[PDB]
Structure 1
Amino acid sequence: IVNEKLQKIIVVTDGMKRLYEYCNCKNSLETLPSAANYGSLLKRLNLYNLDHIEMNVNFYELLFPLTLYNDNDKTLSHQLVNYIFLASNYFQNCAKNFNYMRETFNVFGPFKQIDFMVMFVIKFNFLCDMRNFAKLIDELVPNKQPNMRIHSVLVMRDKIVKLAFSNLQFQTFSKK
């Protein structure tokens, strides 16, 4: 299985949006998630305990399926790399200011699971942007037999994102 991941990502994102009755993909983001946009999302999330929330995104594998698209034609060859760097910077800022993000979201109706809420909104906004990009590139055909040489950039940015999440996790844990 080297291609089913993309369609399963689409399906699981749709199912999660259904489960939490929220599909606000309209508010595409490039600076920082905010309660100004995701306050109702916080309220919806409070309905169900957010135990299944991870302190990382698995950047590389997460974005790997997007490479499958055929770009023989280039459009994807550069738009995808743009997206990779954008995601890298977005996660950098999110992890760097997670405390600021969580104080803000908590100020919006403090939640016992505030950290879960902030992480989930980060994940959800990223998934919305990713699905918008996937629609932008829905014309291209995903398939295996890859040879990119930009997945090396993907690996590098994934390492950077993992280190950022690592510092974030260390802060959260060490602060009791």
Structure 2
Amino acid sequence: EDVDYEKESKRRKLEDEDFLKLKALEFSKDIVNEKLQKIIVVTDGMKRLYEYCNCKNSLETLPSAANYGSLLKRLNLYNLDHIEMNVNFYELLFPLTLYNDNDNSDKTLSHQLVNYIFLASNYFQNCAKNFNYMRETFNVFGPFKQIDFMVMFVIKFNFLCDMRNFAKLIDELVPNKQPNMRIHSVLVMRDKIVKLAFSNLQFQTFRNTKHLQRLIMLMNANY
């Protein structure tokens, strides 16, 4: 017999060495980000919606969209109020921060990421700046009960096409298990001012969904 615990104490002593190795394995990069996987899945993951998005250059309004706006009139059948009027912004863009630029990179990418972030920020700032103008320029095609939601969708979709392109530039570079602290915080504060812009909007609002429902969920940060 050996009733004393010291046997198990020694066993713990042994185990302890592993601790650091285990933790390091628990902090190494991760192979892929399922959020980006979901993006790639949904991108043209529903009937032919890619082909309408001829819009480009990330800084454009009513780029001959009226052709697509006709099909948005047809979409007007749906209760487009299911669309969120707010932009999830950070709550979608978080996965992009899971990249230590010191590795799997020339350390150059984060710069372009911040540039794209400020781009989209100014985009949405102009959207808030001119929404009513945009309302009228598309109301040209006829008022609709949910024209506000239609405009919101137009904005979000046109953004999303560029977002798809931008993501496919990175093309599933290996992410870290955790985001960059400073990039995350910068995103956080810029999202603060962005939601402040939504507050400054001060507007008020004016099933066979499953396909378009996929993109609606994705806009609404379904997970």
Structure possessing the higher radius of gyration over alpha carbons:
2
Q: How far apart are 1:60 and its partner, in Å?
A: 1.2
Q: TM-score, structure 2 length as denominator?
A: 0.64
Equivalent position SS for 1:171? coil
Q: TM-score, structure 1 length as denominator?
A: 0.78
Deviations 1:117-170 (A, max 9, x none): 000011101111111100111152234233241221111110111011112144
Equivalent position SS for 1:132? helix
Gaps of 5+ in 1: none
Q: Distance in 2 between matches of 1:43 and 1:123?
A: 17
Deviations 1:4-52 (A, max 9, x none): 2222233334345657984546564456777457434524533533121
Q: Distance in 2 between matches of 1:21 and 1:112?
A: 27
Change (3 A) 1:50 1:140: same
* Percent identity of paired positions between Structure 1 and Structure 2: 100
Q: Are the aligned partners of 2:90 and 2:187 in contact in 1 as well (CA < 8 Å)?
A: yes
Q: How far apart are 1:57 and its partner, in Å?
A: 0.8
Partner of 1:88: 121
Q: Distance in 2 between matches of 1:6 and 1:33?
A: 27
Q: Distance in 1 between matches of 2:89 and 2:61?
A: 18
Q: How far apart are 1:101 and its partner, in Å?
A: 1.0
Change (3 A) 1:20 1:127: closer
Q: CA RMSD in A?
A: 3.3
Once structures 1 and 2 are overlaid, which stretch shifts more, 100-109 or 40-49? Answer: 40-49
Partner of 2:162: 129
Q: Are the aligned partners of 2:121 and 2:194 in contact in 1 as well (CA < 8 Å)?
A: yes
Change (3 A) 1:10 1:93: same
Deviations 1:41-83 (A, max 9, x none): 5245335331211121122112112223563453321111001
Once structures 1 and 2 are overlaid, which stretch shifts more, 1-10 or 100-109? Answer: 1-10
Match among 146, 152, 167 for residue 179 of structure 2: 146
Is residue 2:88 matched to residue 1:64? no
Once structures 1 and 2 are overlaid, which stretch shifts more, 125-134 or 61-70? Answer: 61-70
Gaps of 5+ in 2: 1-30, 207-223
Change (3 A) 1:128 1:32: same
Equivalent position SS for 2:39? helix
Change (3 A) 1:31 1:39: closer
Change (3 A) 1:32 1:57: farther
Equivalent position SS for 2:43? helix
Q: Distance in 1 between matches of 2:70 and 2:59?
A: 17
Q: Are the aligned partners of 1:33 and 1:122 in contact in 2 as well (CA < 8 Å)?
A: no
Q: Distance in 2 between matches of 1:105 and 1:30?
A: 14
Once structures 1 and 2 are overlaid, which stretch shifts more, 63-72 or 38-47? Answer: 38-47
Q: Distance in 1 between matches of 2:188 and 2:60?
A: 21
